[PDB]
Symmetry: D2
Subunit: 726 residues, 4 copies
């Protein structure tokens, strides 16, 4: 036996906090979690304990350390089939990555509606509050490859596969309510522009280059989603703390045939939270896997990601009641005008077993709808319907991609389609065509109806000529960008200015920067001038006098568009760095950890080396990581307990730890002599808002720190950070 | 649009003679026929009765007759996801056909040994007479595409996948005991030479063209398997009536580590039987699916194909004791020198459910061996081991082809291979590498040993320099062709002469024909002269003086090489045509069918139209087919009962039916006034061996006919057929 | 016309230092840099200036901004073949990345011997100092995907395709003189152990995880190459400032048939230089394309990577 | 895409147009054409927007569909005129 005698190789099969145990496949970590979809994958799960090592043909291998050769220093022989099978499989491990959203992280879960929605839709999964629907959700960035970094500035995808009793429904959304372009025909142009440039394939995971900003400068329809991407929305803290949106108007269809327009929303029940740019960028270096890691670790800890599904609903007769076109996917519907109606809750509660088999191979497509839903003429959605079926033929090797286990419906599926590469189902039907008499015409068509009926499209009226023409109603580009900007807090506006300014500084051709500053001056002058100043660009008198675009249906702001205007903080599943010394004060540590535990906040004990230290009272403190090994980037707040401070007081890494966290607006707490660190971050003796300090870590020391963590970051600190060399 | 109320759309799920019922998928025709492998496929078998028609995503379809369009005469809309899924699946149905043996027909069955072979092999499937091993067997031609004809002149493949408790073993053999070439490196040259020529892709299913005969004339090593292809072995009556051979010397390894050389044989329990060329060629047009159909219908009838597995065993110390090299696959081991030892019986007792899923996707490969078996240095076999794994990467879409259901072992398989296109198995193992501690090194290597051990190669001594060189011992080409020639009956000899004559007459370049005839002069002068005469070629004096090659180890002949010299006929499963008239003498039909039924010989009732005729006693006789629609090519013998003979006496098709059957040497029986047809085939009053005749069909009449059928064809008639214009 | 009046969209076709001009495709940047291989690729190069936008079938497109729909707010029509061809080609852009060394950056160049080596090898490309052999060289990391970061700690690949008059010779080497393992049968074990772990596909571009060190601790043959990787060898400053090695003993064979054992080396004429760990790791965040960019810009500047 | 291995089937020699073809499509399996365009998107300024759209006209013009009137509901229905 190679495993250690004390069994320390095997992670505990129970919820444990991040860093406590090695991570493990989901069915080994959490064997007791189940749902209908996880149960149905059992037929393809493969174990390993107590089994012999074999070829794929089931032949036992005796020596898996050597090739067959003529003498032990001789040539390898062609008859070594065990070598060539093993090397052949290795040689062909890779499949094409997704064209877009190639980088993504996924988990199993379940959804349940709060009440029956049968008055507005006949969709079975929404018909009964007792009906529980397994899901599989993959979150992703858009631009970078499958081996790119998580905390880039980019749009995020938020795709949910609902395994309903009436078919697969895939809700394939993003973490913003709009898209960059209006018509699908342009999608390869936009994507080529944001992707790495074709001569040298640079830059990865970044829109900060010439071709992206060239396209944007020439296509003002893009500016609304660009605003979102340049805001802190483009750098979420966690997949658990971002919004999701369905992007398009779809329809709900009830049993009476009535169509209602719908846009889909996901509300994060952990609240909304994003990083800051310097932190996000550096984190792509310190842990390019941070969001994938955070997701997996949250689920293993029992901090299950939870989201509320919501609908914005618009009666058909209200189609033209707004200043913008409901079909224009560059336009959002302000929640001030049409509120989000809560629909149900989704909980993600199990990681996969094998990332390639379940995550890399999952195929999501927004044309996968079920009776009770339908499309609209959104011309971006229209073109999507073509793409998501098409792309699977190369990505997943052919048209039987629904037979890959993760993609399989749990609902019955029977039809007359046959063959194709990788065909798994063995059809016993004497007929492969209908109508047929030789199998009495089974499987048979089903009329539409209130429940369990066939799909029939809503009989929308179509009238006009065959044209390649943009609707005039889509020809307005600035008013939504403006509403967005006006809805942001002053610190959020500052970060938008800095996003544009940083990205445009990386554009090599100056005229492209100038062209984009011209577009900004059509949205808001203050924005445009602030960006211009950072670029050394002076606005013309003409630019200074551009009339701002009109408000959107009387609105001059909508606070729902801000990450932070309206507090929705939740500290459960957040993490604190605790900076240890060789003689910690145990009573500080006891009080710190007791209060953190009570709110479901994790801790990591950091020091200048691995191993343990011992507190004043003899308690042995295990070390999780070194200061360098687990940088402040990775945590939400830092606490320094009292004790032998002299031990770490001249440690570059320890000092820098507090400077980095300080710069990135994180709460800091210093107890007793740890207050000696106030000098490294230039804190006055009377103290400042956002730095907790006291003789000891309690009475109200932890409550103060926890209040600051509920507000996420210390925005008031922003004027003080420019001074700090960090 | 439904089934007839009488239920006549659905075949009885009981054994039924050919033509009595429509054929059906095996699980529906014979639902109680089971074996371990058939059962294991239940996870993927898909029914149809009582199920709703759906998309592949499980969405019920309301209207499977129409595309979604804007008005009922309008353009089709891109949002029709039901249309596009259905058409996309259809657009991608085809996968690449096999490079060779693309045309093939397959069935399920089982094997068991007669006695334990543990003294010579530790192979588990040969260890116990009561351990049953499921098999799946595919029979094939070689040259033609998957849609080419069955009864071509070609070698046949005979591939058997044994699903053993210690892994899959594929015995991938042919119907002749040698191959055309010596070294795998030449395989693409030979195959390209026999295949359709590259400019115009002609001819299909035929070696009768310049490139094949060019290669043969230049590579005399091919002459032995050419002799076999030109003989009637090239045109089998049925896959049930040909021999199988494993082509190479392999090794058996027992528990004590002793190696014995072995060559594999399959003996058809239905006996050895072939067509004649004119019949074979015409049958490729009248029924290009004759051997596929006959195989399927034999199994539906309960005439299960049975074969006996046999081994030629040579001790290791006898490697060099013959006057040919045991490792030369152009050389056979005469059964006079080394007898076939009977080993066990294989029965094919169920057809597949879906030909594409089970037949087209099956992957056989002779490197798939199991402990107890091993290879040799045969240079043809050596290279085959590279090819059968490599080719599946394109044909079957990647390295997970063992997960396609027909290919899966029934034995456990566990290893550290991961990913690849359309990966089914979801591995839970924390480890994907070994050695590992994190899963205590499972799955683990297993030492070799007497049973359930790891594979280890037999420790054969290798001594030589790295060379591309043919063994001098392989450089003899004429003795085995001569042995084969001399072992044939005189009518078999004539048919060989005729096959070379017919083929070479289609070679356009006359010098190629001349060069082949020169090769024939090195084998046997009588053969060479007989071919030359048909090509209008005259042997030179030198050619006339070529010394015949030596006998093979003293043998002048070996009768086991002939199809017919030793009687081994079995009539069960054969078929007779019964030519009706509009008032059949029911007393004749009664005695005919009674006698046929007693020997398991089937009948097809033929007439000049379809529908029914009524016999003299009121019996209503349904007609299987017209004289033209089921020609005498498709049957073994023809019987004409008495009755209203005037009805058919001047029918051109009925007369021709007898002329064609006569020409092709088939038994014919004529009762009562049907003796009037003796005039069409010029039989004298006295009668003729091979024509049964009497006042009525009785005991004696049927015994005589059945005796003729047990001898397959009436070879003594050959002198009489030159003259018949048919 | 969308280009600026002053023509500042287009980089000068002359050597320029890093950051002075936008970077460009090699045949536009350096039109007059030629070798037999570069010239032979002319049959497939495709330009763009002054040509009409078409489908792949040669049909001129009038409107590349819209789908064909029934009315300007209507549904998209199945008969829009222009849209479908464009979206199809997009949908199928990607091909599988390399199993290992998926991350890599390449350039064209040439090789010339210093003297005839006919006494030791009959290889034609080594037969005369006048023999100029075109090359295409790809440098790579090993572990990370095609979109992973350049300045990780890893072994680097250094692969050279020599287009000789007697066939392609590929010298497929790395930046250390050995490998981790002894027998090819174990390559999928070692590579699975260093790659992202199978349950969750973490970590990218890093050996710093349990399975790699588990395998290393159980397979001491690995320890030599592990030493190189843990050294600053694992974090080169530039593909220009690292050594290359053939990894194996090969043979040279001369005209008499005499065999000589050989191991191959590439010596960087810009000298040996590596980053320090903190700087490398932070650089994966600040510029994950740093080595790819550095190589492209050195060649644009005339700082041609040279190796002996 | 399965039969001919991908979206570059127009570059298989028999399939190639003899007319010029230029566009912003890139990559795919078996890619033969080596595109020198600085741009792989339009509109672009970096290559002066080439290759460029072409208005329809009497000769050598861009493709534009005939502006046929469409009128009706979204239906899966066979026209009665076909019965
Ligand atoms: C609204 C949310 C959204 C929008 C508006 C779009 N994407 Fe996505 N996308 C594909 C193509 C495509 C097109 C043609 C359009 C507008 C025309 C969009 N996108 C905008 C795709 C190339 O077909 C795609 C790549 C892989 C795949 O299977 O489909 C694709 C991916 C994708 C994902 C990834 C889902 C996953 O596997 O995790 C998500 C969340 C979106 N798109 C959202 C989306
Ligand atoms: C010493 C230089 C070296 C060594 C010793 C090895 N690699 Fe490499 N490698 C492939 C397989 C492979 C095996 C089986 C072994 C030992 C048995 C090595 N490697 C060690 C590969 C999977 O066949 C590979 C992946 C893509 C491909 O085409 O081949 C492969 C890549 C590779 C490259 C990249 C060349 C390029 O595409 O730019 C380099 C430089 C090495 N290997 C070096 C190498
Ligand atoms: C080195 C190349 C090579 C050579 C020398 C041989 N084969 Fe082979 N054979 C192949 C390479 C191949 C193949 C190209 O790999 C095929 C077609 C595709 C497949 O899976 O295997 C194949 C198929 C194939 C099949 C069809 C199995 C099926 O039904 O799917 C049979 C029966 C044989 N072969 C039999 C033979 C015999 C009796 C040989 C003489 C001893 C022989 N092959 C030599
Ligand atoms: S969207
Ligand atoms: S053979
Ligand atoms: S190596």
């Amino acid at each position: 036996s190679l495993a250690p005698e004390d069994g320390s190789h095997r992670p505990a099969a129970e919820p444990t906090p991040p860093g406590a145990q090695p991570t493990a496949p989901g069915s080994l970590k959490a064997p007791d979690t189940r749902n209908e979809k996880l149960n149905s994958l059992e037929d393809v799960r493969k174990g390993s304990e107590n089994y012999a090592l074999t070829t794929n043909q089931g032949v036992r291998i005796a020596d898996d350390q050597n090739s067959l050769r003529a003498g032990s220093r001789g040539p390898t022989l062609l008859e070594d089939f065990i070598l060539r099978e093993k090397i052949t499989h290795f040689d062909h491990e890779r499949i094409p990555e997704r064209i877009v959203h190639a980088r993504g992280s996924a988990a199993h879960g379940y959804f349940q509606p709060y009440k029956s929605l049968s008055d507005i839709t006949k969709a079975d999964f929404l018909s009964d509050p007792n009906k529980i629907t397994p899901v599989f959700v993959r979150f992703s960035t858009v631009q970078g490859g499958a081996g790119s970094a998580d905390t880039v500035r980019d749009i995020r995808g938020f795709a949910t596969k609902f395994y309903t009793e009436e078919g697969i429904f895939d809700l394939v959304g993003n973490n913003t309510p709009i898209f960059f372009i209006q018509d699908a025909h342009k999608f390869p142009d936009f994507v080529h522009a944001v992707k790495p440039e074709p001569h040298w394939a640079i830059p990865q995971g970044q829109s900060a280059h010439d071709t992206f900003w060239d396209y944007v400068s020439l296509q003002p329809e893009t500016l609304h989603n660009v605003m979102w991407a340049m805001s802190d929305r483009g750098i979420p803290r966690s997949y658990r703390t971002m919004e999701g949106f369905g992007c398009h108007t779809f329809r709900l269809i009830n049993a009476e045939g009535k169509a209602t327009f719908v846009r889909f929303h996901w509300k994060p029940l952990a609240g909304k939270a994003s990083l800051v740019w310097d932190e996000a960028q550096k984190l792509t270096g310190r842990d390019p896997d941070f969001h994938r890691r955070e997701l997996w670790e949250a689920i293993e800890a029992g901090d299950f990601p939870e989201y509320e599904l919501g609908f914005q609903l618009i009666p058909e007769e209200d189609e033209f009641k707004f200043d913008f076109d409901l079909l224009d996917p560059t336009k959002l519907i302000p929640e001030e005008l049409v509120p989000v109606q809560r629909v149900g809750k989704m909980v993600l509660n199990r990681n996969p077993d094998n990332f390639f088999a379940e995550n890399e191979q999952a195929a999501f497509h927004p044309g996968h709808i079920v009776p009770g839903l339908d499309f609209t003429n959104d011309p971006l959605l229209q073109g999507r319907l073509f793409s998501y079926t098409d792309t699977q033929i190369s990505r997943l090797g052919g048209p039987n991609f629904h037979e890959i286990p993760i993609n399989r419906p749990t609902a019955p599926y029977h039809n007359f389609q046959r063959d194709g590469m990788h065909r798994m189902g063995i059809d016993t039907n004497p007929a492969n065509y209908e109508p047929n008499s030789i199998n009495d015409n089974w499987p048979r068509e089903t009329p539409p109806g209130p429940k369990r009926g066939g799909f029939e499209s809503y009989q929308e009226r179509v009238e006009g000529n065959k044209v390649r023409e943009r609707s005039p109603s889509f020809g307005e580009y600035y008013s939504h960008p403006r509403l967005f900007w006006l809805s942001q807090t002053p610190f959020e506006q500052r970060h938008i200015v800095d996003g544009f300014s940083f990205e445009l500084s990386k554009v090599v051709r100056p005229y492209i920067r100038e062209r984009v500053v011209d577009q900004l001056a059509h949205i808001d002058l203050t924005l445009a001038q602030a960006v211009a100043k950072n670029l050394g660009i002076e606005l013309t008198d003409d630019q200074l006098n551009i009339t701002p675009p009109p408000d959107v249906n009387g609105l001059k702001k909508d606070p729902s568009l801000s990450l932070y205007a309206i507090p929705d903080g939740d500290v459960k599943g957040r993490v604190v760095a605790i900076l240890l010394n060789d003689e910690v004060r145990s009573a500080d540590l006891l009080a710190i950890l007791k209060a953190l535990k009570a709110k479901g906040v994790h801790a990591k004990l950091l020091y200048s080396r691995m191993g343990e230290v011992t507190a004043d009272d003899g308690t042995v403190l295990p070390i999780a990581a070194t200061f360098a090994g687990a940088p402040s980037l990775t945590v939400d707040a830092v606490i320094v307990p009292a004790g032998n401070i002299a031990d770490i007081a001249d440690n570059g890494d320890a000092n820098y730890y507090l400077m980095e966290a300080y710069k990135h607006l994180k709460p800091i707490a210093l107890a007793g002599d740890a207050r000696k660190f106030k000098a490294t971050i230039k804190i006055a003796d009377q103290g400042e808002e956002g730095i907790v300090e006291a003789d000891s870590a309690d009475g109200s020391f932890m409550d103060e720190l926890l209040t600051l963590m509920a507000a996420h970051r210390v925005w008031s600190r922003i004027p003080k950070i420019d001074k700090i060399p960090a």
